[PDB]
Ligand binder design. Structure first.
Ligand SMILES: */C1=C\C(=O)NCC/C=C/[C@H](NC(=O)[C@@H](NC(=O)N[C@H](C(=O)O)C(C)C)C(C)C)C(=O)N[C@H]1C(C)C
Ligand SMILES: */C1=C\C(=O)NCC/C=C/[C@H](NC(=O)[C@@H](NC(=O)N[C@H](C(=O)O)C(C)C)C(C)C)C(=O)N[C@H]1C(C)C
Lengths: 204, 233, 222, 244, 243, 244, 196, 250
């Protein structure tokens, strides 16, 4: 039935002190059948990251679309696109399919290279922009993620702390969702460096 | 002069002439003579068919458009096919939609307007053929003369083509006589053959060389060729 | 969602709550439902959030171009006509319910548009799920000839009626004042009566709590 | 009607030549010279800025070297406006290839496309051809460094060293004189500047009249790098090579 | 090569002959017209010459009502004049429908000027041989005069004249203004502004007029109307009892 | 230069359009036709040349009706004339369909005018080779009009075009002076037949056939009808008498 | 919704309630259902607000353009444009419209255009949900050529009964008088018409 | 009817020249002088308002146009061509950029768009090139201030300062002398007025001159308050008064 519930999966972003984090599970199943535990849902164009939950085919399609668009954007603008701008591009791109949308739940995370300010935003399937200053959740376990975040979260966490927090939010939420899990990955983003870690979680 | 205003039909000459139409009009004069005349009961078409070799055939000059209407051509054979086919559709449309026989006067107006369209719009060329239309409708027997300029006229009789002026004078002279040949087709046809012969020169009208058609009161438009016209030579 | 519009002796003011929802879940606890069409023409929107934003920016964009073309200040009746004809063209498929207001060379104006394209005109209006709660307040306290402050109170009170009594409404109160003589003043988060109480505990985890399978640096430089 | 004013841009001459293509080329011949030299470890693009001034801003300026891809770039000779139209369709073509196959577009595939577009304005449409000639410098894992050339006609060919624009005959001769298969990028870089220096219609070959680009495989990495020199970088290389 | 004179493409001098010849056609009617701005009205006077006895004088006019508020006087052949009027009327109705307010004089003029500009650039469209003078009492700009030509040009005026003797009328008016120092006729009633208009037309042209020699249009707050032969006469008698 | 008369939408150096002027030549060469505006309708008359005894008398009607209250007669290229009427009928039909009321003559006149003026805007079309006299009775009385190949048209008291347009105009102007209080439909019919007979002198070579039609509030009830039988012969007599 | 138009001696009068609804909620209690399409040609709207407004807005545009080209349009013509729109788009419209206009030669005319898209010229017309409750009342009280006073009364009484029984109707009663004298807007409040 | 002009009206001559473009350029030369000057904190563009009748009201006609709140344009050549170009330019800034990214286009890109429109009128069927040259001056966050020139060919280039039209040769020379990479906006405005003077025959005042600049943000010109990140338009057209006050210290 619900297209956004065929493959499953979740994504979640969070802001910390001069840093942003974004994580996702690795499951890609077909209803109850688990099919792949290597389906990362996070992508990036320059220093801007994009996570996408929803129907796998569209997740793939949107990534290929934003790569196309961000590449041309760099060639013409002669600079990499910023988080805020990209958010707009994501929003208009989705609304352009207003009456036959892609079944995805996009999440943007990054640091404005010019202002150094952390940025995260979520969108409904037709572009409605939700720009939160703390966290953004998406996926079949979004309710669980909201519960986790609303409690675990606290402002200006240091990278090392934000990592614990985001990982625990993701992990415990996925464990209550039959369609999420099968491995997770977490990105900790700072002005200078970006670290990627794979979490150890239940495989059921 | 002329050379600067005859490259198409979308150009008027300094004197208000349309040369392309006039040149088209010429193709008719170069065509084989054909005659048309009518009484109050019938309308008749007589045409001289022309051949290429003696190993060839004689190109048909008369075309039936419906059971009550038909015509004879002079000029571009293809164009006559196009126009007569258009006249067949109009006759057909009038029957299918209104269960009404297309009046000859109306058929004429249609042809005129169709022709006119290829004389005011760039790209098109006028039709290079003259047509004589005869038919029997609700107001009786009729004869029309159609010119590629779009001018369509109702007459008692007429002729078009090479040496046509011959027959036309004859009819213009015989008028009072043939227009009264009512209830006697063979007489109207004979008057028609006598008219056309006034435009002969090369030879005399033979059997596979003459073509006659007739329509009237209780006479569905029919063409006669070969031995069928022998009794008139 | 609760959005209202109130006229006062020398202008017009519009207000709205800041809750965004998806089913019974709050999507955004502080979104902005007040949209700027032109400097002095703002519009409050309810219904499908993406729609209130898109249609609002589309007409706004066209109003901008029209203004440059005609060398005149945009007029509310223009935003109103462009919006309604658009919504009508889409047989109500664009879930936008708007309260459009502002001041222009012809005075101050207050209208409302419904998803299918019909429009209303009045001195006080309300739309959204909190529509009824807000309207009860307005029906109980509006009077002709209100002062800028009176109007802001009334508008702000009506939104609260929504925040407190309507489950689809909540959080803060956003206001925008458009007075016939001055610049329009947008008051983002004019009221913030819903601050979360200090959490009972901190859930900051002791580092090393999360089991990591593998690590690596990501190359962002080209 | 209209026929009267139709130039008929797409017809053969009694000799079987395409008038407009010929004339377009005639136009190109007066454009700032552009040179492409391919070495074993890289490619070099050099072009002379036609029309310059004290006031012309150069840090912001670009009129002959355009980046099409991350591994492909072109040098322009002719109508800049016309070139941009083509350049943009080219950038799009590369991105499409990438989206369809998840692989960077092979250099020749991009060139054949652009050449095809041109070829079209040659056979139908009643429009004028693009007054442009491109020198393509790119790299892929199937043919390594490649250097191509396309002109108003819609034909393209590969080269070791080539020039387009003004004084090509002179430039070609000089390159044919000192080019050697075993050249190294810096070798090519010098040969390039020297040739221009000899064909220039100007007094001296100053940096403010040049655009320079190199596609070298930065050894400390293992990948290929595209670099369009900035005013100062050209000013430097101009001193070293011995033209100061 | 010598066709840069038959269609709207450039000549070596960078000129558009077809546009210049279009201007030439505007004088075909051999009629002059002038517009002046009152304190709160706008008036356009135009000569009217109906020498044929078989014509119904009432059906002859180069003045048009584009909308309740916009009035237009044309200098040029009637068929192009009517082609232009009809378009402007449609442009005015449509504008009101889309934007919700009455189209302003200057805007309508800009829109028509742009349309003219296109015939200047597109080869299959010929310019219209007419000069359009639009007048009204704009709700934002007050009395207004905007005129457009076959070149796609237009601008607003304090007053203006058009036709074979445009220069005479113009300099006459220029003078009156160098005198008054104000950019309009300081008159409350339009009847007086109409009288001023006709008076100066006579001075500059050195000709006297009868009620059938003129055509007059007046634009007031929320209405543009034309005068009748009698409305004119009454206005003509008035100037007579001043001289 | 020259050749400003080969393409239609072209402006000559003195601001004219020769193609349209040449059209007028075709009109002037046509049969003479007129229109007289009486005080409750209009009368239309025209010259039908007997090119031969072979033409069936009365059988080639020239005057045409548009809707049920409008009459049209023209001189010049007949086919062009019919073409314009077909457009008029469409235009009248479109108008009625939306506004219910049959098209007012003044509205109809501009419909024809805009259409004809349209054929002087492009070189891909030829101007109309006819001048048309037309009119009828509407909500505001009678209206007579004449349209030129230029698209120009005005309201007339009397109108004439064609070969004998001068004789006619002379005669029409006379009437105007001898009837400052108007003319009756019955009288216009008679007078018209005469004007046609006189104007036939400039073509006295071939014999002709007269045709009259009218639209009078009191005589035809605002509807357009052809004058025939007794009233027709009677007018022929009145004309045949004063022609001697 | 309760709307009616009555032709009388000096012209014609249009009347309507001011209630717009969405279910049982009164979206607007001071609605103006008497819409102007020309100087002296107005209409009464019933059914979809969105549809009737869109239709009216278009007719107004057509009459304005019509005026620019052929002078003043008749009341009949205005009814014709409405009808054309309501008939040709019958499958996507829910508009019951009454067209009333005053002209110097015909006094006042009334054309009712019901849901189907048909047109009906009448001495007076009633429409809207409230109209059903006053068919009897109006049939027994309408007289041709009443005076302005009698007409205003007839309408005030009729609509008060409509407003009384039909929940979709209510608010104030609005009237528009169209005569040679000009255009007059009348408004009657509950307290006044309720106790009639 | 139907535009049968589907073929190019601008073609290559045997010499390789594109006539119509050359002629268009000629038309630009005949045009009234206009110039541009980029300072370290602003850009200025100006031209002379050659009123074509003492009865015309030169204010009702602007040669200096705002394209986006940080980009303005001025020209030389055919006024009507420029006008429609300005409308297209304002629209393209929306349809091809703001509607996609929610922000106005940076100068080079908008210029790039306008340029394309002109290039097309040089190759499309049935049209003539535009008879104008433009000077676009604007500012964007990542590129700062910039000045561009766009020709009828569709070509464009960045400038520190330049002039086009009638006395371009002379004006350009006067600018090459006075310009330096340390000018402050006020200085450029001054150099501007001086440069323009030479090219002006008779009257030279705030009523016969038209000048606007791209400089600091103008919150006062925004029209509303309450949105921190929205600080106001950088484009500002000087007033007749402001121009005269300057001419006094000229
Ligand atoms: C005002 C509340 C309301 O007026 N109505 C309640 C419905 C809420 C709408 C809006 N939230 C959303 O639109 C959410 N997206 C969404 O519903 N998408 C549809 C879906 O079924 O998934 C698509 C369009 C078919 C999400 C963007 C939050 C909301 O909260 N409305 C508020 C106010 C206007 C933000
Ligand atoms: C006259 C009352 C009626 O004639 N008929 C009752 C139907 C009402 C129509 C109109 N009000 C609306 O259209 C309101 N929207 C609406 O009803 N939407 C439907 C819904 O049930 O929510 C959707 C389309 C299923 C709103 C736009 C005001 C009304 O009140 N009609 C009045 C009079 C003509 C205003």
């Amino acid at each position: 039935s619900d297209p956004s519930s065929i493959n499953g999966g979740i994504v979640v972003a969070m802001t910390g002190k001069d840093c942003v984090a974004i994580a996702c599970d690795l499951r890609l199943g077909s209803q109850s059948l688990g099919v792949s535990n290597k389906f990362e849902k996070i992508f990036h164009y320059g220093h801007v990251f994009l996570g996408i939950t929803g129907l796998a085919t569209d997740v793939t399609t949107l990534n290929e679309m934003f790569r196309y668009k961000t590449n041309l954007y760099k060639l013409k603008e002669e600079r990499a696109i910023e988080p805020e701008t990209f958010t707009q591009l994501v929003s208009s791109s989705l609304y352009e399919r207003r009456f036959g949308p892609y079944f995805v739940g996009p999440v943007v995370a990054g640091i404005n290279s010019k202002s150094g300010k952390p940025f995260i935003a979520g969108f409904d399937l037709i572009g409605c922009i939700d720009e939160a200053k703390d966290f953004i959740v998406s996926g079949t376990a979004s309710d669980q993620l909201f519960g986790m975040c609303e409690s675990l979260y606290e402002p200006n966490l240091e990278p090392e702390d934000l990592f614990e927090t985001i990982s625990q939010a993701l992990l415990n939420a996925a464990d209550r969702d039959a369609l999420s899990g099968w491995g997770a990955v977490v990105y900790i983003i700072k002005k200078d460096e970006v670290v990627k870690r794979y979490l150890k979680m239940r495989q059921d | 002069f002329r050379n600067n205003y005859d490259g198409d039909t979308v150009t008027f000459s300094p004197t208000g002439r349309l040369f392309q139409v006039e040149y088209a009009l010429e193709a008719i004069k170069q065509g084989s003579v054909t005659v048309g005349l009518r009484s109050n009961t019938h309308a008749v078409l007589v045409a001289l068919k022309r051949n290429a070799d003696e190993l060839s055939s004689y190109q048909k000059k008369i075309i039936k458009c419906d059971e009550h209407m038909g015509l004879s051509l002079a000029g571009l054979a293809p164009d006559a096919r196009v126009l007569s086919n258009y006249l067949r559709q109009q006759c057909n449309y009038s029957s299918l939609v209104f269960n009404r026989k297309l009046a000859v006067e109306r058929a004429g107006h249609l042809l005129c307007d169709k022709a006119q369209k290829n004389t005011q719009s760039y790209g098109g060329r006028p039709y290079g053929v003259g047509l004589l239309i005869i038919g029997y409708d609700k107001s009786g027997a009729h004869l029309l003369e159609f010119q590629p300029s779009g001018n369509v006229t109702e007459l008692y009789g007429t002729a078009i083509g090479a040496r046509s002026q011959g027959a036309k004078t004859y009819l213009e002279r015989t008028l009072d006589t043939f227009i009264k040949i009512d209830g006697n087709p063979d007489e109207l046809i004979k008057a028609g053959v006598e008219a056309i012969s006034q435009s002969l020169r090369d030879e005399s009208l033979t059997v596979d060389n003459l073509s006659i058609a007739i329509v009237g009161k209780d006479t569905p438009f029919t063409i006669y060729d070969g031995e069928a016209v022998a009794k008139y030579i | 969602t609760t959005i209202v519009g109130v006229k006062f002796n020398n202008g017009v003011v519009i207000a709205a709550d800041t809750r965004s929802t998806q089913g019974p879940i709050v999507a955004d606890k502080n979104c902005a439902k007040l949209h700027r069409i032109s400097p002095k023409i703002w519009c409050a929107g309810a219904g499908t959030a993406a729609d209130t934003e898109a249609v609002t920016q589309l007409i706004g964009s066209n109003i901008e171009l029209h203004s440059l073309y005609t060398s005149r200040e945009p007029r509310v009746v223009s935003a109103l006509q462009m919006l309604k004809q658009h919504l009508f063209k889409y047989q109500g498929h664009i879930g936008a319910y708007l309260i459009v207001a502002g001041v222009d060379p012809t005075g101050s104006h207050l209208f409302s548009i419904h998803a299918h394209g019909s429009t209303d005109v009045g001195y006080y209006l309300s739309l959204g799920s909190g529509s009824l709660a807000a309207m009860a307040v307005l029906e109980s306290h509006w009077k002709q000839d209100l002062t800028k402050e009176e109007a802001i109170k009334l508008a702000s009170d009506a939104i609260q009626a929504g925040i407190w009594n309507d489950l689809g409404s909540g959080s803060n109160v956003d206001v925008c004042v458009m007075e016939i003589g001055k610049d329009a003043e947008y008051l983002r988060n004019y009221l913030t009566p819903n601050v979360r109480e200090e959490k009972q505990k901190s859930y900051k985890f002791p580092r090393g709590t999360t089991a990591v399978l593998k690590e690596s640096i990501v190359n962002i430089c080209d | 009607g209209s026929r009267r004013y139709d130039s008929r841009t797409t017809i053969f001459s009694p000799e079987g030549r395409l008038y407009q293509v010929e004339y377009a080329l005639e136009s190109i011949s007066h454009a700032g010279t552009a040179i492409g030299i391919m070495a074993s470890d890289g490619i070099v693009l050099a072009a002379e800025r036609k029309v310059t001034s004290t006031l012309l801003e150069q840090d912001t300026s670009t009129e002959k070297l355009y980046k099409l891809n991350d591994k492909i770039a072109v040098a322009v000779a002719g109508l800049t406006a016309d070139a941009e139209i083509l350049i943009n369709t080219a950038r799009i073509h590369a991105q499409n290839y990438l989206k369809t196959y998840n692989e960077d577009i092979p250099v020749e595939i991009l060139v054949r496309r652009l050449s095809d577009i041109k070829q079209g304005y040659t056979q139908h449409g009643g429009l004028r051809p693009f007054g442009v000639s491109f020198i393509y410098a790119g790299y892929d894992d199937r043919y390594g460094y490649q250097l191509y050339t396309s002109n108003p006609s819609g034909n393209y060919t590969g080269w070791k060293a080539i020039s387009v624009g003004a004084n090509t005959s002179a430039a070609q001769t000089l390159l044919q004189m000192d080019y050697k298969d075993d050249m190294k990028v810096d070798d090519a870089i010098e040969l390039a500047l020297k040739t221009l220096s000899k064909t220039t219609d100007s007094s001296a070959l100053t940096y403010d009249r040049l655009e320079f680009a190199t596609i070298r495989k930065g050894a400390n990495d293992g990948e290929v790098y595209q670099k369009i020199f900035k005013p100062q970088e050209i000013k430097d290389i101009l001193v070293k090579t011995g033209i100061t | 090569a010598g066709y840069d004179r038959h269609i709207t493409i450039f000549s070596p001098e960078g000129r558009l002959y077809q546009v210049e010849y279009a201007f030439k056609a505007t004088n075909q009617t051999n009629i002059n017209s002038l517009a002046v701005r009152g304190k709160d009205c706008t008036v356009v006077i135009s000569q009217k010459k109906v020498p044929d006895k078989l014509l119904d004088p009432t059906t002859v006019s180069y003045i048009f009502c584009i909308s309740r508020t916009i009035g237009m006087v044309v200098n040029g052949p009637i068929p192009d004049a009517r082609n232009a009027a009809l378009r402007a009327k449609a442009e005015a109705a449509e504008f009101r429908y889309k934007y919700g307010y009455d189209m302003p004089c200057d805007v309508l003029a800009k829109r028509m000027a742009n349309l003219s500009q296109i015939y200047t650039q597109r080869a299959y469209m010929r310019p219209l041989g007419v000069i359009l003078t639009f007048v009204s009492v704009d709700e934002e700009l007050g009395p207004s005069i905007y005129k457009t030509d076959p070149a796609g040009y237009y601008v607003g005026y304090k007053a203006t004249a058009t036709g074979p003797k445009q220069q005479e009328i113009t300099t006459n008016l220029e003078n009156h203004f160098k005198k008054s120092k104000i950019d309009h006729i300081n008159e409350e009633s339009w009847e007086k502004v109409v009288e001023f208009a006709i008076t100066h037309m006579i001075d500059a042209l050195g000709t006297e007029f009868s009620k059938n020699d003129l055509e007059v249009g007046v634009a007031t707050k929320d209405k543009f109307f034309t005068l009748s032969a009698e409305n004119i006469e009454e206005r003509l008698v008035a100037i007579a009892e001043q001289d | 230069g020259t050749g400003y008369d080969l393409s239609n939408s072209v402006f000559s150096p003195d601001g004219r359009n020769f193609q349209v002027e040449y059209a007028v030549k075709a009109v002037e060469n046509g049969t003479t036709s007129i229109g007289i505006k009486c005080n409750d309708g209009v009368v239309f008359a025209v010259e039908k040349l007997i090119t031969s005894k072979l033409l069936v008398p009365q059988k080639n009607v020239k005057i045409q009706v548009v809707d049920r209250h409008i009459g049209c007669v023209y001189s010049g290229l007949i086919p062009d004339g019919r073409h314009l009427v077909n457009r008029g009928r469409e235009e009248a039909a479109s108008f009625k369909k939306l506004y219910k009321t049959p098209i007012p003559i003044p509205a109809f006149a501009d419909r024809l005018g805009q259409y004809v003026q349209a054929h002087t805007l492009y070189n891909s079309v030829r101007p109309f080779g006819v001048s048309t006299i037309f009119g009828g009775v509407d909500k505001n009385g009678a209206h007579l009009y004449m349209l030129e190949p230029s698209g120009s048209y005005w309201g007339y008291k009397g109108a004439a075009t064609g070969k004998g347009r001068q004789s006619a105009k002379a005669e029409l102007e006379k009437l105007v002076d001898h009837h400052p209080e108007g003319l009756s439909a019955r009288e216009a019919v008679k007078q018209a037949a005469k004007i046609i007979y006189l104007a036939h002198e400039d073509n006295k070579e071939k014999d002709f056939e007269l045709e009259i039609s009218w639209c009078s509030l009191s005589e035809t009830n605002g509807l357009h009808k052809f004058v025939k039988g007794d009233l027709l012969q009677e007018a022929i007599d009145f004309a045949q008498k004063e022609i001697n | 919704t309760s709307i009616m138009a009555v032709t009388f001696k000096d012209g014609v009068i249009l009347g309507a309630d001011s209630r717009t609804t969405t279910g049982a909620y009164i979206a607007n209690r001071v609605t103006d259902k008497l819409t102007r399409v020309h100087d002296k040609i107005w209409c009464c709207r019933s059914g979809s607000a969105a549809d009737t407004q869109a239709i009216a807005d278009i007719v107004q545009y057509h009459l304005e353009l019509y005026t620019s080209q052929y002078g003043t349009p008749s009341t009949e013509t205005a009814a014709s444009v409405f009808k054309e729109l309501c008939y040709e788009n019958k499958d996507n419209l829910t508009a019951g419209i009454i067209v009333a206009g005053y002209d110097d030669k015909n006094k006042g005319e009334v054309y009712t255009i019901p849901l189907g898209g048909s047109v009906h010229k009448l001495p007076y017309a009633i429409a809207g949900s409230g109209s059903t409750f006053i068919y009897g009342y109006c049939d027994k009280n309408f007289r041709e050529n009443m005076s302005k006073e009698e007409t205003v009364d007839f309408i005030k009484h009729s609509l008060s009964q409509a407003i009384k029984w039909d929940g979709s109707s209510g608010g104030v009663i609005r009237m528009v008088v169209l005569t040679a004298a000009g255009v007059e807007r009348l408004i009657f409040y509950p307290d006044e018409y309720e106790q009639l | 009817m139907t535009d049968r002009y589907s073929f190019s009206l601008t073609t290559f001559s045997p010499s390789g020249k594109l006539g119509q473009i050359d002629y268009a350029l000629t038309a630009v030369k005949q045009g009234v002088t206009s110039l541009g000057i980029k300072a370290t904190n602003g850009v200025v563009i100006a031209t002379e308002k050659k009123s074509s009748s003492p009865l015309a009201m030169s204010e009702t006609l602007s040669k200096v146009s705002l394209l986006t709140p940080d980009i303005g344009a001025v020209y030389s050549g055919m006024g009507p061509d420029y006008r429609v170009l300005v409308d297209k330019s304002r629209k393209v800034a929306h349809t091809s950029y703001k509607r996609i990214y929610g922000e106005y286009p940076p100068t080079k890109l908008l210029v790039s768009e306008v340029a394309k429109i002109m290039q097309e009128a040089t190759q499309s069927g049935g049209v003539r090139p535009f008879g104008v040259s433009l000077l676009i001056a604007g500012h964007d966050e990542f590129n700062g201030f910039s000045l561009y020139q766009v020709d009828p060919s569709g070509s464009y280039f960045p400038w520190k300062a330049t002039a086009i039209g009638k006395g371009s040769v002379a004006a350009k020379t006067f600018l090459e002398k006075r310009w330096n990479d340390e000018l402050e906006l006020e200085d450029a405005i001054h150099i501007a007025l001086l440069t323009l003077k030479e090219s002006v025959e008779g009257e030279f005042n705030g009523d016969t001159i038209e000048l606007a600049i791209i400089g600091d943000e103008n919150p006062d010109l925004l029209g509303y308050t309450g949105i921190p990140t929205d600080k106001g338009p950088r484009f500002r057209k000087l007033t007749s008064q402001e121009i005269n006050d300057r001419l006094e210290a000229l």
